[PDB]
Design a binder for these strands. Structure first.
Ligand code: MG
Ligand code: MG
Ligand code: MG
Ligand code: MG
Ligand code: MN
Ligand code: MN
Ligand code: MN
Ligand code: ZN
Ligand code: ZN
Lengths: 827, 827
RNA sequence: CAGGAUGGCCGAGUGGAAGGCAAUGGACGUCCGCGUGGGUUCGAACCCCACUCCUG
């Protein structure tokens, strides 16, 4: 049998001894020739349907030899084309002959989903009557036939006769609906039995027809078979069993079997029984009928296995990150931008960390990368863990090289020499290549070379020249498949890609939203948790600058919280102030005013609404912009905020799409918002919670949500320290983490309790939410973090004095976390 | 040669006598067998490429015979599929055998446009190297190859030598880049000429390569050709001529010839010159190389012609309305709705006119239409003129029947029996079928039977049963194709379809516009001429009723003109009133107000805007809708309208897409808006007229725009009467016509002068603009007609006492015409 | 899982149209033709593939 060589970074199938050369194969006997051909074609079909690979075969001669015309032709029928160079390339070295196979189709959603078939096959076993002949459907024909089937006469006069006369001329020829057969006196039953499988499916698949056995083909005379040599009852029984053995596949209800009418009719000669003639009328079958199981092969686990009929039909009719597939080009240009003229190392933080920890690693990698002048080298603590494989102790780092004039190379750097290091690297490279094809949807010729390196002081297969990354197009396509592969797993680069995906969704929704600047002056933007409200605000003020040509000091931003102002101020897109400062100072030169988290404002200090109206309505070029963003789900107090009554907040814009949180956190917010809807506070307007998110909107960005309870403060704090340590070891920056507590009066306690448990994890620097830019974990209260967001969030003991306010705290917390959220409730 | 028979409503090719039956064709000489096969395949390819048809061949025997396996296989190769039934159906009677051919590709923009080639071919004459062999590309392979070409070794060490030793075993086999050929023993130069086209194109098309002539294909020995047999220089000249004779096609510049290296090297035997060996190195060619002209055929006018190389490549690499194709389904359901269980006559106006003008026509049609229990019978004065053919005097009407269980039939009615009637009907039916396929994109099997009838006192081909319209699906598909066919011609049904296309475009724009209802209470809608402002107003009243659940009488519509008021009132979607009635009567019961044509309002009677604000913002269910539709290009007076300043008209919506006028009228409006902008009115703010129509927007609906200047008033009115008569004869109801004069005072003068001529055309009654729903022509002034539309508009002497309004009056006139506009300016 | 098919008839021919009952397939010395259609080869009745019918 055929099995995959286990020690390679690719699917390598060894088919054994094969006779190569046209003359040598001709000198063979037909049996040996066809058996070797079937072995090679099984290997080729399996590799085509399993992501490509290599076929290895030993050849009996030492000098170069051509493949052979029959092998050539079988490959041509396999790919349904004369372009062998596109899918098959051959090398030979001494006694070994290699065929390198490319994948037939790549990815879960190929561009050709409804155009080209899912599988290559040796045969589809689907037959249809093609005029006066029965023909087999190739892969394309069977694909179209199944696609059609899955969508939601004079012969009958003879058929009605009870008996036939010997020598009776039938008036019709063989045609699209009729077939004649005559068989020997000795082997009639066996011939009928071997006839059924080839004609009954052909009639069934194409519109039915009549099959007459006992009629001469040339003279159309009825002859039958002598009574002494046929038992009509046995013949009918065998015919029915024969028809019903046929594998039928359905796409409909009811799923009835193949329908037909069968008649064994006496043939009378001069008024006496000469013999019997068999007559079959086959109705049009509602679905596809196979004569036998399709001859298609696939590599699963480690064996070349044939696809069953149902599995074949399923593939032929029918995490995978759809947003990654959509944005692959933007994501690749953001993260894996291929440089001109120099080799890039990514991610830089992890690279610097590694070369600091391990002396001489810089020199090792630099001496190893001398050949490659242009490309990208992608580092990781362990690509095996990145790809959901097991971790191997002793691995310093793994690097993936994607450079010009070279194949992809996956390096494994070892602190000390090890024999199993090569096996680990080979497994990682095989997984990476199989994912780049099957999951990343790469359609070119790809191979990943596994090369182990050691810091302390079976040959690799040589692929054709076409497998080298010729230039920018190939490098960019491979990196765009790597993006899709990474977005299906959890890792540092996967999370960076998720962040950029969230940014792209925010950009799309802002492009939709920003068209309201020409259509409104007063606008009340009602956003939902994680709807990008603040990003939309900032981008709108940039747009106001661009459109009205007014300078930044002439645009005012007003918010409730000092951390949020401080964040907004550094952008330099405005003058940014707090509600109290706005009420106090003078802003008569301001033309445009933008107000954020208005639901958190208060009426005690003054009429901020009226002040904003007075300032804006005075603008020379007509009234200025006055946009008031707010979110009632994120209310933080039980008093009126000075906003106008609900009915008076017009015109409006609703930001209902969650674009700033990963899928787990988004679903968490959607679940929790029902809790607020079930019991809104008395001060909240009656009908302002009727806003609902877009029904089918999803982000397709992976994240982490975890709730741990019954734990003491020490246990919470050690768990936070451990998680931060793991993230930083993997390569996450500290500025991706923020610790949010219930109230400021607990912030000073938790800061000390956190330095206590984090001094054991080798980072002793924190800060409040007023110094976001610093590379350090932010510890602050949930409320003071309003309008801010961090990739990793640790929510500690949500708490408030009044249950009337308690419901909104959990949402106001979870909305701050982009990807990873850890909550520690009381228990 | 092959010629299309002229007396049929379809493409019929008579290929003469052909031997049919496998047993009969096996008795022929191969030469005759192949010639008959070539004739039939030429006919089939021409019909496939020309929209389908019938192949007529006389058969030499009386009894039914199968087509033959060689013919079947050639057809299978032709369509690249075993599904012959999809395209070819055969019927035979007596000594005649017919093959009915379906079109391969249909329509100007097929759905498979980039998936399948447009042409079927007998041979593409494109070859490529496949490892050791040269294969010809079929239609699909050549299509993909041309697409790829269009989108923007040790053998060298043998080629480097200047001589070879007889019997030398070359150290490499035949491969993708190497071919070995021996010299023929009889005609060496002719053999070389024969072989160069076989192998040079294959190398050139894919990667080039080496062709060794004089090398044993099996032993790889060098043999050459004896010096006494060939002249090396003559051989070189002939080879160069053969290579440069190869057809080539380019998708690039420079368009360079085939680049190759040719070496004639001495073959030495024991040191003495034995003969010559020929080596050609073929560099890869930038584009496609043919061995000869492609073997593709098409019907040109009435000759079955072959496509040239460049013409074939042009077809393979690549009025046709687009909106008709887009909306075919809805347009068909609107006009050509196929009813259940009865036969429908359309258009009913024309049907009634015909049966009133002609006695017994009702009996003729009804007695001819007895068999057809369901379908649609589409009437016209002359389908020939509808299809841009020449009219025939004596034709009463033409009816196109599309019924269940029947092929399409085109009926031609004559008053008196005529010999040319059958020819006229046949030509019309042939044109209609060719249009349904090549222009309407029908992909099924279609035939239009031509039948001639008369009031006063060549057999048709019997098509297969698959050409009958089996039910709703086929009837709908054919009628949807007829919609696209009609939309490309000027006719009554074409104009009706254009009207419905404009309605669908306006529905799309309203779907975009209507979501603003949830987001605004006060809104100013600034529409451009022909932007559908009034239609938006009506539909938004409907949506206000729907979404606020208030009774229709609670919604108020206020306009400036009594005709518009009435045209809105009769629809019961709201209460409609004038400004002069609004400012006086009691409207406290009103909740919501929609104001239209606000730019024409006046302040002399009161503060209409203040009253509207007061009524709306006091409403019992909170502040109600107050939307003010206005259009400054359509200003009718130079005074203040009472609208709030431009700076205060917010929130603001703009309707910039012209969706109410055909393409010529729209272009006229767009051009006149430039004059308006050049000289704006003084009573209008500076900024409003800076709203510009969508630059890239087009309607895709045909119409008439004609300016008839220097006419006198009597000539103007005679022309108007004549044009009205032509329209009414063609089938337009009079209520599609509006006659607009400069001002209301000249209404009576122009009306008297109108009747003075119109009473000669057998229509007497006219209608006022206050009775738009009448079945009579509307004569009124441009100002009084604002807000109303009709298909045909006659503009008489557009002028104003103060020329400052002259720019506005032309647009106020043109915007009223949906499809046909006739302007009669002053001398 | 295999095998046959040759000229009017019987039949010899497996890579440079016998014979037997003056010719004795055909198109225009070239080419087609040995069941039909293709392929390889300088060269096919002869080698390879598909198909037709029948036979083990
Ligand atoms: Mg014989
Ligand atoms: Mg023999
Ligand atoms: Mg033959
Ligand atoms: Mg020959
Ligand atoms: Mn048959
Ligand atoms: Mn048969
Ligand atoms: Mn060769
Ligand atoms: Zn079924
Ligand atoms: Zn070119």
């Amino acid at each position: 049998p055929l099995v995959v060589e286990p020690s390679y970074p690719d699917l390598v199938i060894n088919v054994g001894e094969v006779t190569l050369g046209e003359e040598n194969r001709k000198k063979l006997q037909k049996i040996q020739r066809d058996q070797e051909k079937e072995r090679v074609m099984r290997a080729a079909c399996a590799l085509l349907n399993s992501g490509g690979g290599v076929i290895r075969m030993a050849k009996k001669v030492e000098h170069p030899v051509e493949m052979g015309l029959d092998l050539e032709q079988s490959l041509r029928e396999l790919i349904q084309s004369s372009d062998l160079q596109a899918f098959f390339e051959t090398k030979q070295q001494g006694r070994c002959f290699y065929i390198f196979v490319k994948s037939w189709s790549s990815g879960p959603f190929p561009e050709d989903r409804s155009v080209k078939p899912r599988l290559c096959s040796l045969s589809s076993s689907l037959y249809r009557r093609s005029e006066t002949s029965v023909r087999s459907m190739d892969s394309r024909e069977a694909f179209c036939f199944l696609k059609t089937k899955r969508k939601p006469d004079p012969a009958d006069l003879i058929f009605q006769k009870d008996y036939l006369e010997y020598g009776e001329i039938l008036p019709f020829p063989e045609s699209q609906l009729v077939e004649f057969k005559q068989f020997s006196t000795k082997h009639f039953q066996e011939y009928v039995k071997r006839t059924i499988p080839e004609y009954v499916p052909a009639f069934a698949n194409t519109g039915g027809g009549y099959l007459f056995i006992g009629v001469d083909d040339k003279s159309r005379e009825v002859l039958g078979c002598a009574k002494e040599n046929v038992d009509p009852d046995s013949l009918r029984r065998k015919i029915e069993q024969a028809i019903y053995k046929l594998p039928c596949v359905h796409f409909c209800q009811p799923q009835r079997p193949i329908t037909f009418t069968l008649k064994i009719v006496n043939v009378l000669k001069r008024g006496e029984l000469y013999g019997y003639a068999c007559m079959i009328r086959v109705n049009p079958f509602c679905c596809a009928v196979f004569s036998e199981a399709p001859n298609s092969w696939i590599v699963e686990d480690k064996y070349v296995c044939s696809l069953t009929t149902e599995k074949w039909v399923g593939m032929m009719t029918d995490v995978y990150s759809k947003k990654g597939l959509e944005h692959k080009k933007e994501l690749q240009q953001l993260l894996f931008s291929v440089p001109p003229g120099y080799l890039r190392y990514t991610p830089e933080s992890l690279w610097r960390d590694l070369i600091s920890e391990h002396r001489g690693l810089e020199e090792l990698i630099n001496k190893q990368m001398q050949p490659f002048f242009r490309g990208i080298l992608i580092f990781s603590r362990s690509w095996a863990v990145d790809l959901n494989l097991q971790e191997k102790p002793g691995v310093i780092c793994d690097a993936l090289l994607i450079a010009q004039n070279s194949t992809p190379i996956l390096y494994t750097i070892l602190r000390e020499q090890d024999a199993e290091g090569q096996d680990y690297c080979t497994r990682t490279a095989f997984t990476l290549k199989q994912k780049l094809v099957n999951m990343g949807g790469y359609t070119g010729k790809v191979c990943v070379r596994a090369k182990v390196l050691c810091l302390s002081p079976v040959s690799p297969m040589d692929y054709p020249a076409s497998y080298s990354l010729a230039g920018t197009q190939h490098m960019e396509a491979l990196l765009q498949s790597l993006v899709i592969v990474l977005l299906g797993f959890r890792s540092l680069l996967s999370d960076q890609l998720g962040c950029e995906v969230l940014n792209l969704l925010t950009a799309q929704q802002y492009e939709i939203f920003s068209r309201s600047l020409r259509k409104n002056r007063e606008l009340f933007v009602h956003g939902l948790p994680g709807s990008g409200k603040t990003i939309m605000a900032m981008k709108i003020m940039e747009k106001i600058r661009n459109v009205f040509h007014c300078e930044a000091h002439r645009i005012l931003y007003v918010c409730e919280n000092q951390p949020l102002r401080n964040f907004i101020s550094d952008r330099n897109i405005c003058r940014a102030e707090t509600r109290k400062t706005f009420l106090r100072e003078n802003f008569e030169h301001i033309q445009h005013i933008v107000i954020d988290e208005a639901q958190n404002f208060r009426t005690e200090d003054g009429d901020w609404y009226g002040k904003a109206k007075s300032i804006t309505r005075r603008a020379k070029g007509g009234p200025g912009i006055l946009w008031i963003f707010l979110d009632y789900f994120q209310t933080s107090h039980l008093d009126c905020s000075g906003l106008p009554p609900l009915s008076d907040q017009y015109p409006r814009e609703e930001l209902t799409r969650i674009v700033r949180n990963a899928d787990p956190i988004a679903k968490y917010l959607q679940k929790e918002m029902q809790v607020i809807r079930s019991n809104p506070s008395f001060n909240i307007p009656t009908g302002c919670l009727e806003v609902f998110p877009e029904a089918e909107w999803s982000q397709g960005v992976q994240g982490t949500l975890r709730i741990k309870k019954y734990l003491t403060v020490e246990q919470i704090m050690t768990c936070v320290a451990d998680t931060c340590r793991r993230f930083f070891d993997r390569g996450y920056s500290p500025k991706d983490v923020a610790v949010l507590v219930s109230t400021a009066k607990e912030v000073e306690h938790y800061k000390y309790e956190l330095l206590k448990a984090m001094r054991k994890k080798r980072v002793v620097q924190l800060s409040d939410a007023c110094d976001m830019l610093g590379d350090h974990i932010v510890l602050d209260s949930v409320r003071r973090f309003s309008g801010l967001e961090r990739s990793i969030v640790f929510g500690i003991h949500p708490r408030t004095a009044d249950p009337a306010i308690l419901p909104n705290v959990l949402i106001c917390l979870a909305s701050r976390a982009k990807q990873h959220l850890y909550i520690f409730p009381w228990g």
